[PDB]
Design a protein around this ligand. Structure first.
Ligand SMILES: CSc1ccc(CNC(=O)[C@@H]2CCCN(c3ncnc4nn(-c5ccc(C)cc5)cc34)C2)cc1
Ligand SMILES: CSc1ccc(CNC(=O)[C@@H]2CCCN(c3ncnc4nn(-c5ccc(C)cc5)cc34)C2)cc1
Ligand SMILES: NC(=O)c1cccnc1
Ligand SMILES: NC(=O)c1cccnc1
Ligand SMILES: [Cl-]
Ligand SMILES: [Cl-]
Ligand SMILES: [Cl-]
Ligand code: NA
Lengths: 469, 469
């Protein structure tokens, strides 16, 4: 990895564009104000600091490689070789940057400063926004963690209403997204962001990322169970679906097992194969190791409701203390097709209307959880708010006439708790007046060193729901 | 990277689920039949084969690491240590897999086999679908390349209609997506997929990936120009926007320069600052080095039309041979906000209705180009179609009752030309009848080696538009 080749091309040319006599560029990240996504989980900067920004990130070889690439890419010599060589020679290739950030896992309303970046050497005024591109990719773990948390709020509301408690909430949304994301690196980052809120994942890449960059007291941060796929059912031949089911449940008789049941006819599988032919292998199972029937096609809500109606007629259903129907404890359902925050809401509301407890179900989400998200969802943005030119600080901002939502903050910023316990971003260096308590931004990176780190356990505690609290 | 930890968790348990005495699992990838996206660019498998699948990918240390993680992740011992040890011992950790694929850059209608995977050793029946997760991530470069090519078809239609030629087509959609994708790895993959169709990118990560995995005769596959961002304009102070513009155009007097003009008032900037105050610095520029004015906010079509109306009144507009208005050659526009395939269509049709040539404009697209895409767009899917159990080949498939779109192909597959020169996928080994000539798939991977490969130049030739041919 070469940090000189890890920026948007145009940023190579910006050192020639800033006002002459500029010694400081100070920039900030927010999820701009515009499911409403009123608050965001701050997560993932520590990964970026450690993997890409810390230590000796400039060498003679990286400077020459960048110079050679940019000569061809621009068909001109515009690269700031002198400025990068300055960092190599003066700081042994360590970036003269200070980053201050809200603690990871903090849940912050939209339109607040989450982190700030500034150069610590006047010669490196251009470096603050060089690293915008790398740092703005924090949008992704923020957005995954935030959208996963918003789904946890929906599950918590319906579980509480239909059962009176939150037991097993942290296992109710399982990551099925490894195949559906755009890269191996995205898989690890996204899976780790989902694990801020939940414990169930098949995206194995998330485990190694958490171990390397964050750390847990427990051996692993996420868990799974044996489960079939269409290949392990259909390989038996269509006439032998029952033989596949029997073999699989028997192989994993003492742990929970998920069995995809829609290869040919989900309704037949539930009513006749599970319901009658193999019923003796289901009713013998323990509470700790239930059979989890997995539909994977059709309208998500209609299919869940029809599967529950079938199973409720073939198995001994109880009524819990809230008046909701509960399958026996050896039998559960997972809906792992077509699940995103919108369809999750539709399914749990549909179940509540048909008097089915959310205790009966869990959800698998792949593309909806890890891929169907953009930087525009929370309006994640990085902008310069302060410069020093000719030794004088000036408050800098954009305010496009056709879009007031794109207006940016002015001056030096700080994040504070309000008297009512909410959050406020003070602009124009007004934090210096000390009318609002301590600034919540902490130095996390300075002059090539990570200065403050968070464990994954601390991040999970910070990101808890109020209902859990 | 550890390929043993690079699969969906449930696949760790599948070796125990296939029928006893299964010697072969044969699987295939397609963009299932369901802007219509009727044809897909096959691109990106070669990256995956080289980076993740070739050579010694199993070691004693990688087996022990996977064993230790899966013991905690499943809270049980289910990991196939013996199976992975067999590959390490017998094949020096090279995967006993054969992959056959359509040549990269090929443009193939939906619902055709694009690649097949099978084990070459009967002991490794379980390995075919272990690597589904890694291989299915090819959805991403396929989908970026396909959606980029569909935008090229729109630009080609309107450029031809308004100008009579395709001059500059390959520069008309520029990648601005580096900050808006989910990881560094995704940035390189997605940028490379856009460069199958276009030559303009700010996502520098794409260049290294292409050089390393594909190659080009030219020194670089993609190009950019100096350009401003809001920080380099706003840092001057709101009252000094003219000074910023003047400094920037003067710094890049002899190459094209893009200047974001919407920091405070895009209409004022065009009419008064560019139009009057700095007009003398614009009219003096060469055809090879125009000023490119960049709006970045407001309704994308309405803002482009108003910017063009303003500039047409301040600069000497001509009428081209098709009767469309053309700014002088020293002045162009780039719309780099809110561009996706839908808004691109809306803008070029709106320009045509107002008699503005598409010669006047280029587009920048970021999240729309590289991030706002999912595996569901082209229904990218990997399924088992053939197994050998007890020495007998079985044609296997899924056919869910509630969704006929999810039905999968049966048996051994091959790709052929029809008598009319179209594509057909033959099922159930019917390719062997030689009624449709030779299979168009080539072996690209066998027993740990990449056996056939494509330069980036060949991929570009394969992905050309008919209108270009
Ligand atoms: C489906 S509904 C269920 C399932 C299994 C069970 C068996 N019990 C377990 O697995 C342990 C112990 C008790 C708490 N607990 C869970 N509680 C509620 N719900 C859960 N769900 N899960 C889940 C597991 C695997 C996946 C892939 C997805 C979700 C796990 C859930 C995790 C009980 C209920
Ligand atoms: C805006 S419209 C233009 C712009 C610049 C120019 C100056 N000319 C160039 O740059 C070379 C030589 C001639 C062909 N040629 C281009 N032709 C049409 N169109 C283009 N567009 N571009 C483009 C450049 C940079 C970006 C970031 C995006 C698009 C580049 C374009 C690339 C002419 C027309
Ligand atoms: N465990 C599962 O059922 C699963 C995992 C990943 C994708 N789809 C299903
Ligand atoms: N070159 C540009 O104008 C640019 C690049 C990346 C993102 N936004 C704008
Ligand atoms: Cl060095
Ligand atoms: Cl599956
Ligand atoms: Cl910009
Ligand atoms: Na070894």
């Amino acid at each position: 990895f070469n940090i000189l080749l890890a920026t948007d091309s145009y940023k190579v040319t910006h050192y020639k564009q800033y006002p002459p006599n500029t010694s400081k560029v100070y920039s900030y990240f927010e999820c701009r104000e515009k499911v409403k996504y009123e608050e965001t989980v701050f997560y993932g900067l520590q990964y970026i600091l450690n993997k890409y920004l810390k230590g000796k990130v400039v060498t003679k070889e990286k400077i020459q490689e960048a110079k050679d690439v940019y000569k061809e890419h621009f068909q001109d010599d515009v690269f700031n070789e002198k400025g990068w060589n300055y960092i190599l020679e003066k700081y042994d290739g360590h970036l003269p940057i200070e980053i201050k950030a809200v603690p990871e896992g903090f849940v912050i309303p939209r339109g607040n400063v989450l982190f700030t970046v500034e150069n610590t050497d006047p010669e490196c005024y251009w470096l603050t926004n060089w690293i915008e591109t790398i740092l703005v990719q924090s949008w992704y773990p923020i957005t995954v963690a935030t959208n996963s948390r918003e789904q946890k709020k929906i599950l918590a509301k319906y579980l509480l209403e239909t059962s009176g408690n939150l037991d097993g909430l942290e296992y109710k949304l399982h990551d099925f997204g490894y195949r559906g994301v755009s890269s191996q690196e995205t898989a690890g980052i996204g899976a780790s962001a989902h694990l801020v809120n939940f414990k169930g994942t098949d995206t194995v890449a998330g485990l190694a990322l958490i171990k390397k960059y964050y750390g847990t007291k427990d051996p692993v941060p996420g868990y799974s169970v044996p489960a079939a796929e269409h290949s392990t059912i259909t390989a038996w031949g269509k006439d032998h679906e029952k033989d596949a089911f029997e073999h699989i449940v028997t192989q994993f008789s003492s742990v929970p097992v998920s069995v995809v049941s829609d290869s040919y006819d989900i309704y037949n599988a539930c009513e006749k194969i599970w319901g009658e032919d193999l019923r003796h292998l289901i009713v013998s199972r323990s509470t700790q190791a239930p059979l989890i029937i997995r539909p994977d096609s059709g309208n998500p809500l209609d299919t869940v409701l029809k599967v529950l109606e079938i199973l409720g007629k073939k198995f001994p259903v109880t009524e819990n203390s809230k008046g909701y129907k509960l399958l026996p404890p050896y039998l559960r359902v997972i809906q792992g097709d077509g699940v995103d925050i919108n369809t999750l809401q539709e399914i749990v509301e549909g179940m509540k209307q048909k008097m089915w407890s959310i205790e009966n179900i869990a959800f698998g989400s792949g593309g909806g959880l890890l891929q169907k998200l953009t930087r525009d969802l929370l309006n994640c943005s990085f902008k310069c708010s302060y410069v020093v030119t000719n030794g004088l600080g000036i408050n800098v901002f954009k305010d496009p006439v056709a879009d007031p939502n794109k207006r940016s903050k002015k001056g030096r910023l700080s994040l504070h708790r309000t008297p009512a316990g909410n959050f406020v971003t003070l602009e124009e260096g007004k934090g210096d007046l000390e009318e609002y308590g301590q600034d919540l931004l902490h130095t996390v990176f300075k002059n090539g060193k990570v200065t403050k780190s968070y464990s994954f356990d601390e991040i999970r505690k910070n990101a808890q729901l109020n209902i859990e609290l």
